[PDB]
N, C-alpha and C. Protein backbone atom coordinates (compact mmCIF):
# COMPACT_ATOMS: atom_id res chain seq x y z
N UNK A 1 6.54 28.77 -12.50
CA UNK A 1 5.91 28.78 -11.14
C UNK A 1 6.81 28.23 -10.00
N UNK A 2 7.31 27.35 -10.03
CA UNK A 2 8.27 26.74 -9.13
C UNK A 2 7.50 24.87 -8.78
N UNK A 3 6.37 24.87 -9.32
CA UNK A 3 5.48 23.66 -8.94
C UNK A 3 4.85 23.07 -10.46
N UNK A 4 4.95 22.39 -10.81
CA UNK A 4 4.24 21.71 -12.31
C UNK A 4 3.60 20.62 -11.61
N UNK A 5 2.10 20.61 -12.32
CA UNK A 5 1.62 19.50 -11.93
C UNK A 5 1.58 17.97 -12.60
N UNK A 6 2.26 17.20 -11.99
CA UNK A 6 2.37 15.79 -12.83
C UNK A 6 1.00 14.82 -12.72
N UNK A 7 -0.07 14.78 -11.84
CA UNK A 7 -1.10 13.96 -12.07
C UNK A 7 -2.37 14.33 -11.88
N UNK A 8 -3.29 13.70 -12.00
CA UNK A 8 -4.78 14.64 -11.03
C UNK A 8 -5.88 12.74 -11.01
N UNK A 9 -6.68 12.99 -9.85
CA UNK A 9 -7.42 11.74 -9.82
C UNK A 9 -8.60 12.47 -9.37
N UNK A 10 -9.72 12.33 -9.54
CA UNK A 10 -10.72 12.45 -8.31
C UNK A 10 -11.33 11.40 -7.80
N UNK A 11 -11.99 11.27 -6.93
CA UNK A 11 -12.17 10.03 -5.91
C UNK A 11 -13.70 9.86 -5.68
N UNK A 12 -14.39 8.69 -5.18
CA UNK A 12 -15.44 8.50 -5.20
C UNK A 12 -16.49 9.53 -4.56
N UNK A 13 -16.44 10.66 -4.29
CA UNK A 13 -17.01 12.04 -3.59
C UNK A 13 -16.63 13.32 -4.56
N UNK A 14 -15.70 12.80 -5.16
CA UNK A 14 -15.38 14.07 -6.26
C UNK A 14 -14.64 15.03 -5.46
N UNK A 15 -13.37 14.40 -4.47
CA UNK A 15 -12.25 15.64 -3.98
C UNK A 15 -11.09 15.13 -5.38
N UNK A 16 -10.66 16.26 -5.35
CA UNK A 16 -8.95 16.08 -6.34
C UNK A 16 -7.95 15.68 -5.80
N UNK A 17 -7.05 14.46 -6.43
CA UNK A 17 -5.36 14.23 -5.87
C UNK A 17 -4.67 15.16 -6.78
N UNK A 18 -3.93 15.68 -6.08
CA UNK A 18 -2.83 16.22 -7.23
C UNK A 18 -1.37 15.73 -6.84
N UNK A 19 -0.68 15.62 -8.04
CA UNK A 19 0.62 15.15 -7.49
C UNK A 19 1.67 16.30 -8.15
N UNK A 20 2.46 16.52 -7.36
CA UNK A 20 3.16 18.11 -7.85
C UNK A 20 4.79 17.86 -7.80
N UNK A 21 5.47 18.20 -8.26
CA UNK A 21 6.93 18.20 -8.15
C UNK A 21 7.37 19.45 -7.71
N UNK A 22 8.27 19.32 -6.88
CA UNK A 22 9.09 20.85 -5.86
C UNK A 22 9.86 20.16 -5.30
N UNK A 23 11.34 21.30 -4.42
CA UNK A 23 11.93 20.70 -3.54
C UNK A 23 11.41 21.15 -2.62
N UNK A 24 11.40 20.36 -1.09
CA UNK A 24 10.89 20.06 0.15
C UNK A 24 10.73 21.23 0.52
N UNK A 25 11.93 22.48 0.26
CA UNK A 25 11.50 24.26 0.74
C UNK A 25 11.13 24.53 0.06
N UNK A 26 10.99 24.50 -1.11
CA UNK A 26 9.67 25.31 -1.82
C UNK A 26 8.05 25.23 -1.15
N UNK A 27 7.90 23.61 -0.28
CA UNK A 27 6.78 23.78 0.24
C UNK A 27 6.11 24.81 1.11
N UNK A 28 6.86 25.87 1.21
CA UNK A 28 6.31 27.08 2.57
C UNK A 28 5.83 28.11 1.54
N UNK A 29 6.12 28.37 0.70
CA UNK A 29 5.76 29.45 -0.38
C UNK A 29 4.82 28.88 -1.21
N UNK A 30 3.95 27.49 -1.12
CA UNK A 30 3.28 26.92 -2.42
C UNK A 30 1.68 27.77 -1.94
N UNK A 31 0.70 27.45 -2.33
CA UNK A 31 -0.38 28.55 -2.17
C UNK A 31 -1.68 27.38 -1.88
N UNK A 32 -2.10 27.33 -0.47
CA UNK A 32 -2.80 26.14 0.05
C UNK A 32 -2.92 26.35 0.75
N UNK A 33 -4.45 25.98 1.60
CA UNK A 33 -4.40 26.47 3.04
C UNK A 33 -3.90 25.71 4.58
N UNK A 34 -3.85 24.49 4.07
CA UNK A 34 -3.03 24.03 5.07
C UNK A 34 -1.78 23.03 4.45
N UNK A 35 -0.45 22.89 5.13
CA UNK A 35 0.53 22.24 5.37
C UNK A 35 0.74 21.76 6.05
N UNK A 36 1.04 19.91 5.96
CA UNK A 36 1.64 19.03 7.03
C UNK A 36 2.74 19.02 6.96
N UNK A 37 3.89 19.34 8.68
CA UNK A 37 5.19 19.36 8.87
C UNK A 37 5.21 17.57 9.68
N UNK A 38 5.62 16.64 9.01
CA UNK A 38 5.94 16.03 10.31
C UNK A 38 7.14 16.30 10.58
N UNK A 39 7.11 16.53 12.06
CA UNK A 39 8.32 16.35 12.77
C UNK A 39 7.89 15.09 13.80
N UNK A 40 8.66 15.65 15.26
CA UNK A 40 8.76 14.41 16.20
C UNK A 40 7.34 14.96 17.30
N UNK A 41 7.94 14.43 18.37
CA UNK A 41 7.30 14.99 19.71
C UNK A 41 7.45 16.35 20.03
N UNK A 42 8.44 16.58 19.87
CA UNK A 42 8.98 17.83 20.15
C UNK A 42 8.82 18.84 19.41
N UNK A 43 8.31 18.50 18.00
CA UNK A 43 7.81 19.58 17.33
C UNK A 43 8.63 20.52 16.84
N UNK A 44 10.59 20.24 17.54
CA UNK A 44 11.26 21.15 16.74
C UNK A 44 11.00 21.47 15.14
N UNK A 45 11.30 22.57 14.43
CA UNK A 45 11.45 22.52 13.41
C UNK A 45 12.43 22.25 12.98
N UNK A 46 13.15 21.51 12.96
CA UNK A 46 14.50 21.15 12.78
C UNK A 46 15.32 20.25 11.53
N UNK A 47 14.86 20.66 10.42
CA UNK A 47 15.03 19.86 8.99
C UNK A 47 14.65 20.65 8.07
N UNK A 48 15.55 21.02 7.31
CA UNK A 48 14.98 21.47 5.26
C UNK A 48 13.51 22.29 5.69
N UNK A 49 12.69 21.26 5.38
CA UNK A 49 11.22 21.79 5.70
C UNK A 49 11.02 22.71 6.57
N UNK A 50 11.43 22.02 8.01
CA UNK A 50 11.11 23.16 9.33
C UNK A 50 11.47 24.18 9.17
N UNK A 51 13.05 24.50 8.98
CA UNK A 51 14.07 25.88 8.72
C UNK A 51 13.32 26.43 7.93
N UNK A 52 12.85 26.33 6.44
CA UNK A 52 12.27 26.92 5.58
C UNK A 52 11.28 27.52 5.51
N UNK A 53 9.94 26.99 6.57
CA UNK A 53 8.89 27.40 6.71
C UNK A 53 9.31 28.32 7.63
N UNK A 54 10.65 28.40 8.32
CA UNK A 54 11.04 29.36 9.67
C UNK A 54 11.34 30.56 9.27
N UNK A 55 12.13 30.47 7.89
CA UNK A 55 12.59 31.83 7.10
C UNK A 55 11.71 32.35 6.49
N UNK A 56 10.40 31.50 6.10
CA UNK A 56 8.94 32.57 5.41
C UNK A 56 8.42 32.69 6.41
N UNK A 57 8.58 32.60 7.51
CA UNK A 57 7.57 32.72 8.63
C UNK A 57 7.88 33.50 9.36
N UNK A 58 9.00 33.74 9.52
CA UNK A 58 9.43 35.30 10.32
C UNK A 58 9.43 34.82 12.16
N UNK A 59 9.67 35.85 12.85
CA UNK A 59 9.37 35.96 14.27
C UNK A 59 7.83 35.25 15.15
N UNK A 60 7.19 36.03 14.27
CA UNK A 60 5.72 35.78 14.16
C UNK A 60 5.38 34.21 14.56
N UNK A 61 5.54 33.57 13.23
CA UNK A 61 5.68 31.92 13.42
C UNK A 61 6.60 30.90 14.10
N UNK A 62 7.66 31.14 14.54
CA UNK A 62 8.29 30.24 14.82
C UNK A 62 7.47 31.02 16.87
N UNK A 63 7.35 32.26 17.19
CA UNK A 63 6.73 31.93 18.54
C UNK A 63 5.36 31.54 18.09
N UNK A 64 4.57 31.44 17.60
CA UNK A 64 3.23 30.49 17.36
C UNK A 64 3.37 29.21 17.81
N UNK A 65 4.56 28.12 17.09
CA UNK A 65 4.85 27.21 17.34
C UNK A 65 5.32 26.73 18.71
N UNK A 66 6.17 27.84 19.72
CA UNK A 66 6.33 27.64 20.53
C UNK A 66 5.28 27.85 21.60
N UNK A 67 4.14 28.73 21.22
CA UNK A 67 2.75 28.54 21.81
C UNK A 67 2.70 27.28 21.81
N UNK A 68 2.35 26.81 20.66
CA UNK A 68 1.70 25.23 20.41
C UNK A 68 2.66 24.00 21.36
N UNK A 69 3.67 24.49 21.25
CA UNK A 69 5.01 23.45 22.24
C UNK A 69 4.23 23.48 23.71
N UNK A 70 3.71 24.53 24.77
CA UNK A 70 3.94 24.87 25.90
C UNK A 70 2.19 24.17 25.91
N UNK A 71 1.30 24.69 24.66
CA UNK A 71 -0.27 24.44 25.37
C UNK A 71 -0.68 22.78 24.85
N UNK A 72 0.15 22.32 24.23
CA UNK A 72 0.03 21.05 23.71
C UNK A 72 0.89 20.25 24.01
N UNK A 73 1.92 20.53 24.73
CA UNK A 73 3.22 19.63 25.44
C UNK A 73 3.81 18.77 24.36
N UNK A 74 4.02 17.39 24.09
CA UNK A 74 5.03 16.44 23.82
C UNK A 74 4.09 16.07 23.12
N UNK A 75 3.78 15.81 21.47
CA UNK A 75 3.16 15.32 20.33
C UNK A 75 3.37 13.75 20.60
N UNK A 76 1.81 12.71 20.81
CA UNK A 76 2.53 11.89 20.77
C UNK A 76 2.07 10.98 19.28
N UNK A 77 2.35 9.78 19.25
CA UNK A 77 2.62 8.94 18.31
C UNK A 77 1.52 8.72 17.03
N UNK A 78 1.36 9.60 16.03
CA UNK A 78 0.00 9.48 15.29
C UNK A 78 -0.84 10.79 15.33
N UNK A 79 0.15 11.39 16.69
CA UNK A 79 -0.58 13.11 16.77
C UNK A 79 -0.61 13.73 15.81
N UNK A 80 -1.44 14.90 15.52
CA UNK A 80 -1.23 15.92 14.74
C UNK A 80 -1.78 17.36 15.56
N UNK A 81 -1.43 18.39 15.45
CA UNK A 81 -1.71 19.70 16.13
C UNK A 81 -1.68 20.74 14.99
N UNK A 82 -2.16 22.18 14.76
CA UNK A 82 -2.01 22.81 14.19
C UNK A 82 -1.30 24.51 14.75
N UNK A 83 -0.89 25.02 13.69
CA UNK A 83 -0.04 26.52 13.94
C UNK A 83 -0.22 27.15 12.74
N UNK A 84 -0.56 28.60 13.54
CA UNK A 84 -1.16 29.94 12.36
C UNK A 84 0.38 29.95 11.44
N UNK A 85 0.10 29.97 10.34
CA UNK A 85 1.29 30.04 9.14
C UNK A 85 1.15 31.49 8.66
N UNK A 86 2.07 32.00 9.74
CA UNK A 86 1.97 33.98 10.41
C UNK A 86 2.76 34.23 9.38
N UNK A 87 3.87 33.36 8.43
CA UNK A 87 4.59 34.04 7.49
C UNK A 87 4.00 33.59 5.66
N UNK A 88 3.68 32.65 5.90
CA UNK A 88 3.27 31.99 4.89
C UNK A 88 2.01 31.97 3.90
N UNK A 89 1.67 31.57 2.83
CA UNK A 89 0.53 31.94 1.76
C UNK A 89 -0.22 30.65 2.75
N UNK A 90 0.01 30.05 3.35
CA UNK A 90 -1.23 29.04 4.08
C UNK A 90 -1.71 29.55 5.64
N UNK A 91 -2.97 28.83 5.53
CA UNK A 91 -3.82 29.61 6.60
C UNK A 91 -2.92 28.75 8.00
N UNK A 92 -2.91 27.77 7.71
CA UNK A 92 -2.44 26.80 8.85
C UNK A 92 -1.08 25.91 8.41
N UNK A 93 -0.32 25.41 9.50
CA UNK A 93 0.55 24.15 9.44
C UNK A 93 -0.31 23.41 10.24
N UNK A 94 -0.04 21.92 9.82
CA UNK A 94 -0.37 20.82 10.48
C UNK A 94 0.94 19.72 10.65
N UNK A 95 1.18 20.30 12.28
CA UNK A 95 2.07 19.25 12.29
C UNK A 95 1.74 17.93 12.83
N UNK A 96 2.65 17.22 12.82
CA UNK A 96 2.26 15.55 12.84
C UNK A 96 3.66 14.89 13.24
N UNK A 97 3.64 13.90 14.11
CA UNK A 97 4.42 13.03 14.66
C UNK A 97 4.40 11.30 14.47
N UNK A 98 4.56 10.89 12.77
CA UNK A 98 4.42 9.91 12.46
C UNK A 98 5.34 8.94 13.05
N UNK A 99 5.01 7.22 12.83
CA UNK A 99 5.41 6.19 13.51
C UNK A 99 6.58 5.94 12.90
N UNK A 100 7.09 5.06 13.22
CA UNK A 100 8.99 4.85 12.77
C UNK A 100 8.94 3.68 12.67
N UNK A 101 9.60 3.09 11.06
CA UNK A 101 9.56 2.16 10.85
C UNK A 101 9.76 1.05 11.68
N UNK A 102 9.31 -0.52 11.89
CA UNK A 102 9.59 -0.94 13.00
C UNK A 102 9.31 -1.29 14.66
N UNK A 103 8.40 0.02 14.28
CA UNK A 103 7.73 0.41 15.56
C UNK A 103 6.73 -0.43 15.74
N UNK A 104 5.99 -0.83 16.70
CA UNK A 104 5.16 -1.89 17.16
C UNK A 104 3.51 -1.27 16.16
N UNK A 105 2.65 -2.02 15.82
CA UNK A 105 1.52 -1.27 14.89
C UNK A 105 1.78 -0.29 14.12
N UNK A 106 3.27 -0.07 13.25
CA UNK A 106 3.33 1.13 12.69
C UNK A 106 2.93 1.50 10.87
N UNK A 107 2.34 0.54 10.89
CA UNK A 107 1.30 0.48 9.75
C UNK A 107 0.15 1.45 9.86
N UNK A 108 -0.97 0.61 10.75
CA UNK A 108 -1.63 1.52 11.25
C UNK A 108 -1.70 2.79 11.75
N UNK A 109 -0.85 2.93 12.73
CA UNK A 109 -0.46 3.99 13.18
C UNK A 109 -0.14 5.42 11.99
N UNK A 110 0.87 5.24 10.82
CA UNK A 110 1.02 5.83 10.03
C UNK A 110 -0.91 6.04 9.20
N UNK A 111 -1.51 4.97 8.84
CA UNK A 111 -2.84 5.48 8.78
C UNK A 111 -3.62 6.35 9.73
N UNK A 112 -2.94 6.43 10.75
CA UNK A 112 -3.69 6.92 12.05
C UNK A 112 -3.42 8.65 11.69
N UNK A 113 -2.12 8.68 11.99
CA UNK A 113 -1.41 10.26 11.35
C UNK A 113 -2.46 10.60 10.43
N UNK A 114 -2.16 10.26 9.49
CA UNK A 114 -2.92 10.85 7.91
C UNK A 114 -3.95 11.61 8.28
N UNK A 115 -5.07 10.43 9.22
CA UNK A 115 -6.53 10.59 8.92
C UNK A 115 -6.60 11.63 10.63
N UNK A 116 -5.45 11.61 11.29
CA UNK A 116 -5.43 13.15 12.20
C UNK A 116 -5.31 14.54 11.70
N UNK A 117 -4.62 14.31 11.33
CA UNK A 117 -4.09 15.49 9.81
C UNK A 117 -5.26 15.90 9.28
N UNK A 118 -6.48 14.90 8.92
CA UNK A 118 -7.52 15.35 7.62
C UNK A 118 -8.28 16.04 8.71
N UNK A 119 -8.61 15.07 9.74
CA UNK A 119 -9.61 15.43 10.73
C UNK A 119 -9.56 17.12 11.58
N UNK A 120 -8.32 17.41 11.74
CA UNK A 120 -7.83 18.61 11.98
C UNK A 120 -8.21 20.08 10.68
N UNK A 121 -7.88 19.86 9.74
CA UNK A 121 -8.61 20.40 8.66
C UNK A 121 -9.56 20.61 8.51
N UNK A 122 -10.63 19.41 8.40
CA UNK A 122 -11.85 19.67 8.50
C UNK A 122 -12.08 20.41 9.54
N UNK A 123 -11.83 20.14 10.61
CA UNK A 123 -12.69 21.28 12.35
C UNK A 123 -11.83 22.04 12.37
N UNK A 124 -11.02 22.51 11.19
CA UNK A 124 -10.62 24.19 11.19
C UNK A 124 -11.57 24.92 9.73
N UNK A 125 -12.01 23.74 9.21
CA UNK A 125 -12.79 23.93 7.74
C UNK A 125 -12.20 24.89 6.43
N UNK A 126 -10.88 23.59 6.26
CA UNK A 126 -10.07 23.86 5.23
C UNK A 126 -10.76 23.25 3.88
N UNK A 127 -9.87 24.55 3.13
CA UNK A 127 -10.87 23.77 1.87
C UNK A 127 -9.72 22.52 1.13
N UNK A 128 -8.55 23.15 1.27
CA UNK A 128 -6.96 22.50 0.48
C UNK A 128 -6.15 22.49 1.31
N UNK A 129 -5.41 21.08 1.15
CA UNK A 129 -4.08 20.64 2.18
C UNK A 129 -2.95 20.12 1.29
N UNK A 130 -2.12 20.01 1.51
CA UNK A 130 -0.90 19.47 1.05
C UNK A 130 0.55 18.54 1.67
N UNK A 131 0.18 17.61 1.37
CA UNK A 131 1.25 16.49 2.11
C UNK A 131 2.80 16.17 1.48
N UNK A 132 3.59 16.44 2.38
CA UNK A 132 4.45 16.08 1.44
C UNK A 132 4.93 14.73 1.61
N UNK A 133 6.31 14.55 1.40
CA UNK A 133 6.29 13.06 1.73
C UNK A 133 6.24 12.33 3.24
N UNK A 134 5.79 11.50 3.54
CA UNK A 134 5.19 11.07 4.51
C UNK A 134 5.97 9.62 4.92
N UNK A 135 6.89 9.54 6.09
CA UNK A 135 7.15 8.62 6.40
C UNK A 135 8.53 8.04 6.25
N UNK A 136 8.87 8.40 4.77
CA UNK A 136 9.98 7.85 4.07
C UNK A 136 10.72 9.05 4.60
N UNK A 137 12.16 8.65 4.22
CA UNK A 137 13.54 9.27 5.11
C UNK A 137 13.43 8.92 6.41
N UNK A 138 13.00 9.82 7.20
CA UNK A 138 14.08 9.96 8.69
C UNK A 138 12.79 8.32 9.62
N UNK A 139 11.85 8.69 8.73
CA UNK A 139 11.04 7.10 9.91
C UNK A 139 11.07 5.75 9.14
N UNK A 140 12.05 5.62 7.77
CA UNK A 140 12.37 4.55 7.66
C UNK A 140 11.29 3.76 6.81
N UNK A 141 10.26 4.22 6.46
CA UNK A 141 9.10 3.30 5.84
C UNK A 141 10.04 2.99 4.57
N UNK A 142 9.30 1.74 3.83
CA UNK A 142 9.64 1.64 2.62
C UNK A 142 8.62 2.73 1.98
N UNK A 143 9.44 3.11 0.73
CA UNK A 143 8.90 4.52 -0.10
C UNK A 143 7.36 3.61 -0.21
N UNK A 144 7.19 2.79 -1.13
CA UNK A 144 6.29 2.18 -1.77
C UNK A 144 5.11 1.68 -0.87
N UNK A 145 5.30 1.12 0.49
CA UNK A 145 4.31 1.00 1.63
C UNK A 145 3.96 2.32 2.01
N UNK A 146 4.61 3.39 2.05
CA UNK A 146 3.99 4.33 2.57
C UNK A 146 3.00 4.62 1.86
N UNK A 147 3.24 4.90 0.43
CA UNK A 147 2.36 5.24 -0.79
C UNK A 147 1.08 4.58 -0.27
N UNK A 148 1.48 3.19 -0.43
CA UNK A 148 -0.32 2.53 -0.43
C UNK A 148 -0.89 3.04 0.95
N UNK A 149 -0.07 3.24 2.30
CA UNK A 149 -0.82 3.08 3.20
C UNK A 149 -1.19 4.77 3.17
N UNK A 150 -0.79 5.89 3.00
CA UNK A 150 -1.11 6.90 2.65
C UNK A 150 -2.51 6.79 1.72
N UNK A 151 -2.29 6.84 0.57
CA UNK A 151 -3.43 6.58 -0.25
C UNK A 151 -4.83 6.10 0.32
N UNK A 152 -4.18 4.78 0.82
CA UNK A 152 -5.42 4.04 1.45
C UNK A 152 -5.77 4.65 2.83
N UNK A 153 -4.99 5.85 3.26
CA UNK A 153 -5.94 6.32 4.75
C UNK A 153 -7.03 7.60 3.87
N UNK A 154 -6.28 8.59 3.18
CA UNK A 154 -7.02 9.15 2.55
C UNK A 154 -8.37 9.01 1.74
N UNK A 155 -8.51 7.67 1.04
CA UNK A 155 -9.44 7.23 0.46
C UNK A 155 -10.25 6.64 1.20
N UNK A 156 -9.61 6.12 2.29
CA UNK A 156 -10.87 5.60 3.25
C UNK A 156 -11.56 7.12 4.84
N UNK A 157 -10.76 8.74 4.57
CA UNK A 157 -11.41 9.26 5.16
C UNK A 157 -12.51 9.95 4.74
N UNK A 158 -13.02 9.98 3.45
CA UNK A 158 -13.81 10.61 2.55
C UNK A 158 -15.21 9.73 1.99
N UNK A 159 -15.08 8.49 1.79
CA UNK A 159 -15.87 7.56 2.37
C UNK A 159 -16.44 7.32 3.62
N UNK A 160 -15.36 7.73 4.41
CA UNK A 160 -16.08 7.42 5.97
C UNK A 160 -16.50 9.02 6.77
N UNK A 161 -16.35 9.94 6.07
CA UNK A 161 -16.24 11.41 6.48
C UNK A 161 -16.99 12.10 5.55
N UNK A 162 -19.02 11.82 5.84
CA UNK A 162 -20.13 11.96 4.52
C UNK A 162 -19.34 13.28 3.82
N UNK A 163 -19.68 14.35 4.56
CA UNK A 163 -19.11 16.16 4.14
C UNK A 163 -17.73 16.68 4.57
N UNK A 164 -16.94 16.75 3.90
CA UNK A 164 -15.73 17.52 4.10
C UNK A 164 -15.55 18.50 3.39
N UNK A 165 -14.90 19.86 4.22
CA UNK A 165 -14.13 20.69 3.82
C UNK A 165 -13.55 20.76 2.70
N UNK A 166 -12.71 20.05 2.69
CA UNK A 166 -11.36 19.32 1.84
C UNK A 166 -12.14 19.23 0.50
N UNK A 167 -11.59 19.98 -0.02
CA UNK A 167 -11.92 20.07 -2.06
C UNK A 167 -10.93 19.20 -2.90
N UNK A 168 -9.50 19.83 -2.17
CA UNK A 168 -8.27 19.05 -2.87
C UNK A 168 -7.13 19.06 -2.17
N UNK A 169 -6.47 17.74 -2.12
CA UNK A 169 -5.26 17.20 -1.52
C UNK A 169 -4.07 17.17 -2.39
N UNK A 170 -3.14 17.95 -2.25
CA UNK A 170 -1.68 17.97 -2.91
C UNK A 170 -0.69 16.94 -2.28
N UNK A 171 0.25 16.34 -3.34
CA UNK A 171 1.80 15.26 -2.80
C UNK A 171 2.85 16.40 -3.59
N UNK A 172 3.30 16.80 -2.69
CA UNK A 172 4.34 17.80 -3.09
C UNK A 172 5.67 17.20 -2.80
N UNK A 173 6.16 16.04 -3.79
CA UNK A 173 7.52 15.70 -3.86
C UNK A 173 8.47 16.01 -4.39
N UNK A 174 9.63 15.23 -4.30
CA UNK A 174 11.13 15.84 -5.12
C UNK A 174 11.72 14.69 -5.73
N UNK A 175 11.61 13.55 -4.82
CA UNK A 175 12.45 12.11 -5.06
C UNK A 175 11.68 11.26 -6.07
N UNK A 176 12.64 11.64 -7.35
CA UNK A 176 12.02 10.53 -8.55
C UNK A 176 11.73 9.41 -8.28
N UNK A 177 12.25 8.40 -7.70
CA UNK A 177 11.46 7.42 -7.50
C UNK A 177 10.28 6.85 -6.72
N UNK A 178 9.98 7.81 -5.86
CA UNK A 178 8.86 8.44 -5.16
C UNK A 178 7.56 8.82 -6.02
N UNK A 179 8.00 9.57 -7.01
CA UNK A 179 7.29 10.29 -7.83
C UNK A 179 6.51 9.23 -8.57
N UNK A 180 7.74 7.84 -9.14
CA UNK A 180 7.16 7.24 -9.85
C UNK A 180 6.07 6.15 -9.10
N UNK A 181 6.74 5.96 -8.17
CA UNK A 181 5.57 4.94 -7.04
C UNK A 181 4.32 5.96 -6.66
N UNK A 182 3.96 7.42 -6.56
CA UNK A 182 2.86 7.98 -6.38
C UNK A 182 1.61 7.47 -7.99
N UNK A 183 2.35 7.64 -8.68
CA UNK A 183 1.56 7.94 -10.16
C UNK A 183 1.13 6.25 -10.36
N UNK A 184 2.09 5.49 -10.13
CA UNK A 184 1.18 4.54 -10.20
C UNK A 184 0.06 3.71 -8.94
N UNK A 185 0.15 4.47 -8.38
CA UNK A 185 -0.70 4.19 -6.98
C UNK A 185 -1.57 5.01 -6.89
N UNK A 186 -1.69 6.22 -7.87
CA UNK A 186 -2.71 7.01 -8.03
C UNK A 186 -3.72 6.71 -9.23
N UNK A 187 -3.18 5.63 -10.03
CA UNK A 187 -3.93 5.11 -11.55
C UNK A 187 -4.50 3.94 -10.12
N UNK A 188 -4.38 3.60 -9.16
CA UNK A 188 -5.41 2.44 -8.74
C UNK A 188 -6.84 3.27 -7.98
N UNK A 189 -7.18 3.88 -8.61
CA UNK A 189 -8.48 4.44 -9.11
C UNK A 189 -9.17 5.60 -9.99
């Protein structure tokens, strides 16, 4: 397939975690209805991910995105926005403009992202999303804080969000030691 699945949890509402192994471009071809890109403000696509989803996406998608640039201006800090995935097996991208390590509240803030991301899904009434890694690389989190604070925005939007959309949430990583900090942060429930 190009994706093996390494874990599964379900959560106090009965949605699914799945934790999946791929590299970062394989994420545009995986089969889900929505995908989170973070990028910046600017929303370039401009990294592995972006380019990749640019080459399954054709003409089509990359001016979608530049719709979304002109009617949504400058993404700011914790934003998330969405774009028709005109080339892709997903109904939607969800992009997102997470906090940078360092940054003043960027704990929170990174919880803030997440639970924009879910909230966006739901009021497009997705059933499946898929995150990939979140935070770590270019914004500097430690791998292992992101994990918990990820985890812990997710688990606390499904509790706090009676009916959702959302059936099941994918971690579509690559970086083994990533991998190994998901699985055990996914046995804490």
């Amino acid at each position: 397939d190009g994706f093996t699945v390494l874990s599964t949890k379900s959560l106090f509402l009965g949605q699914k975690l799945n934790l999946i192994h791929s590299e970062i471009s394989n994420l545009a071809g995986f089969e889900v209805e929505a995908i989170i890109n973070p990028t910046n403000a600017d929303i370039d696509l401009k990294d592995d991910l972006g380019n990749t989803l640019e080459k399954k996406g054709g003409k089509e998608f990359v001016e979608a995105v530049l719709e979304l640039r002109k009617k949504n201006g400058p993404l700011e800090v914790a934003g998330a926005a969405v774009s028709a995935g005109h080339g892709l097996p997903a109904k939607f991208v969800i992009h997102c403009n997470s906090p940078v390590w360092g940054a003043d509240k960027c704990e929170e803030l990174l919880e803030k992202t997440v639970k924009n991301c879910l909230a966006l899904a739901d009021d497009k009434k997705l059933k499946s999303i898929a995150f990939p890694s979140i935070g770590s690389g270019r914004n500097g989190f430690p791998k292992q804080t992101a994990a918990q604070l990820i985890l812990k925005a997710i688990s606390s939007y499904f509790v706090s969000t009676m009916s959702s959309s959302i059936k099941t949430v994918y971690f579509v990583l690559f970086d083994s030691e990533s991998i190994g900090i998901y699985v055990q942060e996914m046995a804490k429930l």
